[PDB]
Amino acid sequence: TMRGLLVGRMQPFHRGALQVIKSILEEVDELIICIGSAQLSHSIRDPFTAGERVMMLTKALSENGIPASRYYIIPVQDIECNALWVGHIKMLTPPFDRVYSGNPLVQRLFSEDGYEVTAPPLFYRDRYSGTEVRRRMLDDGDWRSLLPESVVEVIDEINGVERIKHLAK
Amino acid sequence: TMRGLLVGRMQPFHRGALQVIKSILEEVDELIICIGSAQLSHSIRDPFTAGERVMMLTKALSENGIPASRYYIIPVQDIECNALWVGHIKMLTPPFDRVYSGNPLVQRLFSEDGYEVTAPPLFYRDRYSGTEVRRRMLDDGDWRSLLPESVVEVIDEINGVERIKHLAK
Amino acid sequence: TMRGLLVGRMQPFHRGALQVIKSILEEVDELIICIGSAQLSHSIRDPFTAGERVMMLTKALSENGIPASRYYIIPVQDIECNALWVGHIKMLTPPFDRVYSGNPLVQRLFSEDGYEVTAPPLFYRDRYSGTEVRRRMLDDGDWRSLLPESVVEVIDEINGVERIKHLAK
Amino acid sequence: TMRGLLVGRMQPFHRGALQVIKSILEEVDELIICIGSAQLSHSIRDPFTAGERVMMLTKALSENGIPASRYYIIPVQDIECNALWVGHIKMLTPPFDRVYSGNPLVQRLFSEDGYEVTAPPLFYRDRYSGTEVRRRMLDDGDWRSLLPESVVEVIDEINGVERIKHLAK
Amino acid sequence: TMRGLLVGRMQPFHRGALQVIKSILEEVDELIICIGSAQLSHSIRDPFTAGERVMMLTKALSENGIPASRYYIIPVQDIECNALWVGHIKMLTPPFDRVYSGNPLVQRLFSEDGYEVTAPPLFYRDRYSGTEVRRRMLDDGDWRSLLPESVVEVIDEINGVERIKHLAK
Amino acid sequence: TMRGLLVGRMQPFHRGALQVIKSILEEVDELIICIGSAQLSHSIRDPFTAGERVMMLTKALSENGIPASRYYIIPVQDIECNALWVGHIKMLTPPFDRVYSGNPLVQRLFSEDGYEVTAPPLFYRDRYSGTEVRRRMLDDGDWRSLLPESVVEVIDEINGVERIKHLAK
């Protein structure tokens, strides 16, 4: 049984990311989705806490009919040592075989540790990235389109827009 | 929409705990299951890492037909300050309303923070607790009975018995 | 009893800060004065150690005759979790009713935690900010004027000018 | 100026400690009073947070007629490296000259750094220990008589008894 | 090149430890000597600081003529995550091939990480353990005998006996 | 015995630093060499782990004919409190007397603690900075000539070039 690993900040979790996740789910049996930088919250760049993000990511995946048996959602706070980050991820995740990531460091860190590393099967355009979303949330610009309905609801509940706006004064 | 919170070490996740979880699931809409002491591993008292435990707890819940939309599985490392632990749980979980727990500290900490706290609707006997399980794993005594099949499989994969035994020399 | 809270780096404690403290003291019974970033020291931006600033405040608030029963001085180091910061502050301070701040992040954080948040009743021009005081110590300007005597005295003892000047080299 | 240092858990602050403090003032211009183990709270041995203790101290010292210029109250959280604790204490406090401690480690550590060290002037009788005080709160005893009224009023506000008692269950 | 690894508290470095180190040096090209619990100091159990023990080893290994090209001395503080410990050790040490330990936990940890694990080639009676050395310094026994001269010399400089004796009071 | 201290990132160790080290030995009985920022690795500015650096140092010092009794190599991880760094350094090293540093903060901090401080004897030309060395590895330049062979052999073993280059993508 083959398990893959993915790591992203998910600020917030958007359709782009989701399309990538479904993509990987066609190559592996189970995917371990790691919410990176779980310590950052309340900032224009990282406005949501690990909690809210686990929530968005949980409701969005069970909303798209993706069987809980196919994935794991784990928060991962950043640590001072790059040389200890993989060991850090490993202690928080189930045993995995392939690491999906197009980031040089993440690739190199896992690569150096013996894992098989590849780039995600899909690449979404910046127009769909969180920066657009957050940018729209502030500039009142239909950020919802870029997000899964369940995620909009999470954002609605936690007053995501109100927050990111005040933090922007 | 009502959400409850539960916190346990889950070393390992056993049928007792599971029966309690299904119990709470009849009173609340969603349950946030917190794997406490996520930093302890490789010891007779706490032999499994946060990772393996998220895994057991994930496979056992999707094995009993419990809809992913009804729960959240979050690791929670212990912190030096009891006075900051609830804020610690809150930052890692989705917004919750009721805290289930029969432990004086956990009750008092959440109670003091404004949350509604009650005792779990069900109480399993020690013969079913992790101490029995671990005790059996060492003493070769049919620990499997006490655990959900999916959990046995996790334990099998990570060589749980081999580990806890060596740690016991 | 009305307890308010204020939080700033006080690097160093200058007259404006005291003008504001005196004014907040007109609408609240007691004022909790939290020394932010208590862990930063020996830098052009943050030259004094938490210890020294706790000395500056205590000495200035006395020099200006202010019943010690009306204020508290508590150092507070920064934590990597903004979502944990308020609970952190709370754990180190007497129970308070209102928070005084102009910073959006401090404002939002304390607000999301359910506290009454408000702006200081007085805003002081940069001309009298810590930057101006620090820049003078460096360029041999008139820094003593921008500060309470007891503060000038503390700075002389610890050799603040000497230190800040060396670090500038 | 001759500043002396004093360190203790103060769980909670009792008349005994107070007289000791007055005694020390009789031989030191100023008394830097460090509240140890600031990170512990909500346990039988350490019921109060630090902020709570900072309140008791600040209140008792202002109600027993003691110049706010003659003392400092600094919460100090314990740290793993004993060989780095005195430095820690220093960093969080004003400059001192003599350490008043009855504890061997506290003595050996401060002296090792070169500080003048000497035992506490008085040695308040028993019936004046946090233990007896905490015990009475548990067993409905007369703890109030062992604490300065100013402190008793604090314990009432934070419902200490109710806490220590629930925690005790 | 065959690099082995050893790890112990060395509180203090005694003859037996050296007898074992010399023997491990007969089957490996270089030996990585990790000073465990580098954060503990000033206690009856762990009296010396990482600094001092790094001095003891370096001085003893030289006194006994051992090419410096054959060994490394690296302090290692303990971390709360056993599952992270090996990666921690690795980050601080040259690449190694085999680990020498009698402790089950160190054995299991390094083993689960894929390293060759083996017992020291020599076991020394308690009579010559750190406990015996420490107990003599306290009871005025013959501690110098149980240790290499360079070690006795280091202990004299830092006043190890004085310290250990005071902490005993 | 007159021990002097030296601190640097050594990313990586080059001939320049080495000559500086020999120079210092010409005026100090022993040289405590602290490798700073031990917690950084796998970045362009800090490619090597600490264990890697400890290897380069240990190797270069044993191959350039220098008595293992005349030096110590101690990895030092940076810490948040500048006012607690020299104490930190102390705790991890043998007792020293003089600090050789060209850095203003390092100077101001050590001197503030009372240590004799003086600049590095030599001032090795440019073309001998980690920057140039790291640059050459990136641009297939001749970095080897800037490092002692002993170090070059280390970089080859940990495939530094391959790393810094991938990281660079």
Ligand SMILES: NC(=O)c1ccc[n+]([C@@H]2O[C@H](COP(=O)([O-])OP(=O)(O)OC[C@H]3O[C@@H](n4cnc5c(N)ncnc54)[C@H](O)[C@@H]3O)[C@@H](O)[C@H]2O)c1
């Ligand atoms: N030492 C440490 O603590 C350490 C070391 C490495 C990484 N991390 C963490 O790992 C997490 C992952 O970081 P990362 O480098 O992937 O950055 P990231 O998760 O922040 O994403 C980087 C960029 O990649 C884009 N992206 C991601 N997947 C994409 C895809 N399939 N198609 C198109 N664009 C895509 C994102 O929109 C974003 O702008 C972070 O939270 C980081 O902090 C921590």
Ligand SMILES: NC(=O)c1ccc[n+]([C@@H]2O[C@H](COP(=O)([O-])OP(=O)(O)OC[C@H]3O[C@@H](n4cnc5c(N)ncnc54)[C@H](O)[C@@H]3O)[C@@H](O)[C@H]2O)c1
């Ligand atoms: N400051 C802090 O870091 C802090 C403060 C409080 C709690 N915690 C953490 O919270 C977690 C929860 O601790 P806890 O007090 O519940 O202890 P626990 O999870 O270890 O469980 C305590 C005992 O309760 C039993 N139990 C649990 N639910 C039961 C039920 N329904 N019926 C019968 N028996 C049951 C378990 O088998 C166990 O023996 C721990 O991991 C603890 O470390 C951390």
Ligand SMILES: NC(=O)c1ccc[n+]([C@@H]2O[C@H](COP(=O)([O-])OP(=O)(O)OC[C@H]3O[C@@H](n4cnc5c(N)ncnc54)[C@H](O)[C@@H]3O)[C@@H](O)[C@H]2O)c1
């Ligand atoms: N997670 C965390 O650790 C966390 C989260 C938030 C804030 N903090 C800390 O809170 C502390 C307070 O930060 P802050 O945002 O107030 O910044 P600050 O204290 O550094 O002050 C910000 C600026 O506002 C000016 N200012 C303050 N009060 C003023 C007034 N009444 N009139 C005019 N100018 C005024 C100051 O002179 C300064 O230039 C900091 O130490 C910060 O690090 C920590």
Ligand SMILES: NC(=O)c1ccc[n+]([C@@H]2O[C@H](COP(=O)([O-])OP(=O)(O)OC[C@H]3O[C@@H](n4cnc5c(N)ncnc54)[C@H](O)[C@@H]3O)[C@@H](O)[C@H]2O)c1
């Ligand atoms: N590395 C570290 O984090 C580190 C190292 C050393 C000490 N500390 C801290 O230092 C603090 C001080 O501890 P401590 O040993 O003084 O304990 P303490 O003062 O909190 O209590 C020790 C006992 O001394 C008694 N006592 C004190 N003065 C007395 C007097 N004059 N007459 C009679 N009885 C008296 C108290 O009633 C109490 O029972 C602790 O909070 C400890 O955590 C921390």
Ligand SMILES: NC(=O)c1ccc[n+]([C@@H]2O[C@H](COP(=O)([O-])OP(=O)(O)OC[C@H]3O[C@@H](n4cnc5c(N)ncnc54)[C@H](O)[C@@H]3O)[C@@H](O)[C@H]2O)c1
């Ligand atoms: N997570 C973590 O931080 C973590 C996990 C595991 C181990 N460690 C550390 O690893 C270090 C090593 O621990 P350890 O288990 O070896 O304990 P230890 O170094 O304290 O030694 C254990 C006992 O074994 C004895 N001993 C050692 N070698 C011997 C030999 N060849 N013959 C006879 N007796 C011998 C010692 O004298 C001692 O009484 C410790 O500092 C420990 O804290 C840390």
Ligand SMILES: NC(=O)c1ccc[n+]([C@@H]2O[C@H](COP(=O)([O-])OP(=O)(O)OC[C@H]3O[C@@H](n4cnc5c(N)ncnc54)[C@H](O)[C@@H]3O)[C@@H](O)[C@H]2O)c1
């Ligand atoms: N609180 C803390 O954690 C804290 C406080 C202070 C310093 N530090 C650490 O101290 C370490 C030392 O830093 P640093 O400032 O010495 O930097 P460094 O030595 O790592 O580099 C500074 C520059 O000095 C150059 N240099 C040094 N000696 C020279 C000489 N004789 N001739 C020519 N050029 C020379 C180096 O080539 C380099 O470019 C750092 O790793 C830093 O992180 C940490």
